[PDB]
From a paper:
[name] (FPPS; EC 2.5.1.10) is a promising antibiotic drug target as it represents the point of convergence of these two pathways. The enzyme belongs to a large group of prenyltransferases responsible for the principal bond-forming reactions of isoprenoid biosynthesis. The mevalonate and nonmevalonate pathways both produce isopentenyl pyrophosphate (IPP), which along with its isomer dimethyl­allyl diphosphate (DMAPP) is converted through a ‘head-to-tail’ condensation reaction to form geranyl diphosphate (GPP) by FPPS. In summary, this work provides the first functional and structural insights into FPPS from the opportunistic pathogen [name].
Two structures of PaFPPS with bound GPP were determined in the course of this study: a ternary complex with GPP and Mg2+ and a quaternary complex with GPP, Mg2+ and a small molecule derived from screening of a fragment-based library. The overall structures of the enzyme sub­units in these two complexes are very similar to the structure of the unliganded enzyme (r.m.s.d. values of around 0.3 Å) and no large-scale conformational changes have been observed. Note that the lid region, residues Ala227–Gly254, is also disordered in these two structures. In the PaFPPS complex GPP is well defined in both subunits, whereas in the quaternary complex GPP is only bound to subunit A. However, the binding mode and interactions of GPP with protein residues and Mg2+ ions are identical in the two complexes. We were able to determine crystal structures of these hits with PaFPPS, including a ternary enzyme–GPP–[name] complex. In the ternary PaFPPS–GPP–fragment complex, the fragments only bound to site SPB-1. Finally, we note a systematic difference in the occupancy of ligands in the two subunits of PaFPPS. It appears not to be related to soaking of ligands into the active site, i.e. differences in accessibility of the two active sites in the asymmetric unit, as this finding also holds for the PaFPPS–GPP–fragment complex obtained by co-crystallization. It is possible that these observations reflect cooperative behaviour in the dimeric enzyme with respect to substrate/ligand binding, but this remains to be corroborated by further experimental studies.
Author numbering:
A (entry chain A): 0 to 164, 167 to 227, 247 to 294
B (entry chain B): 0 to 163, 166 to 228, 247 to 292
Write the structure that this text describes.
């Protein structure tokens, strides 16, 4: 599988596009823009960009069409991690072994940098030079991202995670579907929209794909860490379920052409990682 | 008093629209949505909605056309105040004698509720049923609000404030223009775009208006506090004179506008009394 090569290509592409967004328009704003840059340019794997590019290719679009989509979903993702790391939330000093933004700078600056990243995400999609889709398509991208990022999506999931106490599998899945599923789903949907060849049946299929891989990731993460999927189902039964989720993802792409292979490969990668 | 009646009408209208946005879609989200509601439905005067409605009317649009614009700018405003109140920012326990959101609920909840409000402001403008403008207009409204709300606007102003040091007037005005001026200017621009009649000249004139009133609000707030601030820099009498000069610049920007701009004229006068 060339998923590692595909991941590296999407990472490089989106990293170049993102890095160009962090130039302060005036000197008084330099430190804020530095905190924004620090919060995004942290060597992340850019899975949500990968998804946008791969969904766009799956429907036959040239990947560059999805550049704004890739940037927007990464910006949302980045802003959410900054807030998640804050003392009032997870109170993390480190993220992937490097100081969190509130430690590198200060708490007010982290809060603010991340708020500015959220606005930027929406700016990038509404900018018809950076996101040169048909207007109705740009508006649909923005609608979907705002719904996915907001209180009925990602932020909702963070609230559900914080508010939770024994969860059963159904409740764990509701939490995951909001906290990470919504934005994963939006990454796929936005890339699909960026293709210019979206239609309802393909969008629905791609939504099924995205649902399945979003959960697969969480199941396999729990397995690798060994109220978790192994605790709930048993270890070996959790491993089984990860395969079933991969299979649902692959089945959702039945009938898609070979250009959907990156999506297929990602589905396998998620459950094969050791 | 004409302005008082106009403000009351805008307040009631936008409050009805806003209140309807805070219904949790499922039970696990109820407390979050309560915190969102608590943060917005707080008896605010709704100056930014007023500006959107009045700019729309100034260009001959029916005010209802600006309903989404009015919501969006108020949602931005509301979110900004929730984050500003947090312990790491202004650490404010009360706003008009009522607990701030982090006090009423908890800090994480407040952070999250406000993050959701920001997303919602964009959702409301991108929704073509709620914001039924021509699609190019919807996108321009969203572009302008995201620029005004973000790190080059409102958030930038908050960063300049934390980064500030005896400021001189010029530096104080750079701070104010970002921290509050961007969003005031966006409110006027979005209401003007909602009219369906915007043109480059009228937009530019309305921007000059908005610049002037945005600063006049700050100068007059400082004066009222007395009755690094405008009175401290200039002395009380000269700060008062400056507020009057800004009102004059605002009225001058409205040269040529029809009587439907009277609300804007009246607001400019109200601010400096
Ligand atoms: C609305 C906000 C701030 C959302 C955060 C969403 C999210 C994915 C947080 C990380 O989860 P985690 O805390 O379980 O994972 P990590 O180990 O990455 O902190
Ligand atoms: O370690 C690496 O740099 C690549 C590991 N990796 C990979 O090979 O494919 C991926 C897809 C998403 C995220 C990570 C992936
Ligand atoms: O007494 C009140 O509650 C409203 C006073 N008020 C008014 O009369 O016009 C206004 C415009 C903007 C904000 C407040 C205004
Ligand atoms: Mg967390
Ligand atoms: Mg965490
Ligand atoms: Mg887990
Ligand atoms: Mg403050
Ligand atoms: Mg305060
Ligand atoms: Mg107070
Ligand atoms: Mg002041």
């Amino acid at each position: 599988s060339m998923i590692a090569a595909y991941q590296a290509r999407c990472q490089a592409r989106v990293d170049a596009a993102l890095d160009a967004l962090f130039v302060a328009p005036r000197e008084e704003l330099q430190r804020l823009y530095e905190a924004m840059r620090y919060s995004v340019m942290n060597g992340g794997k850019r899975v949500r960009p990968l998804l946008a590019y791969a969904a766009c290719e799956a429907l036959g679009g040239a990947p560059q069409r999805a550049d704004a989509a890739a940037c927007a979903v990464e910006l949302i993702h980045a802003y959410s991690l900054v807030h998640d790391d804050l003392p009032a939330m997870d109170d993390d000093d480190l993220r992937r072994g490097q100081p969190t933004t509130h430690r590198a700078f200060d708490e007010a600056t982290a809060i603010l940098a991340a708020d500015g990243l959220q606005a930027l995400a929406f700016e990038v999609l509404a900018d018809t030079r950076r996101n040169p889709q048909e207007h109705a398509v740009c508006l649909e991208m923005l609608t979907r991202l705002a719904r996915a990022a907001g209180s009925a999506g990602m932020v909702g999931g963070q609230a559900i995670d914080l508010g939770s106490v024994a969860l059963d599998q159904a409740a764990l899945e509701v939490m995951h579907r909001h906290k990470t599923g919504a934005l994963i789903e939006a990454s796929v949907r936005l890339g699909a929209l960026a293709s210019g060849r979206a239609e309802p049946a393909s969008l629905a299929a791609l939504e099924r794909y995205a649902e399945a891989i979003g959960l697969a990731f969480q199941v396999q993460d729990d397995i690798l860490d060994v109220p978790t999927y192994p605790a709930l189902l048993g270890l070996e039964a959790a491993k089984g379920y990860a395969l079933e989720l991969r299979d649902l993802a692959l089945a959702a792409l039945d009938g898609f052409p070979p250009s959907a292979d990156p999506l297929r490969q990602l589905a396998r990668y998620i459950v094969e990682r050791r």
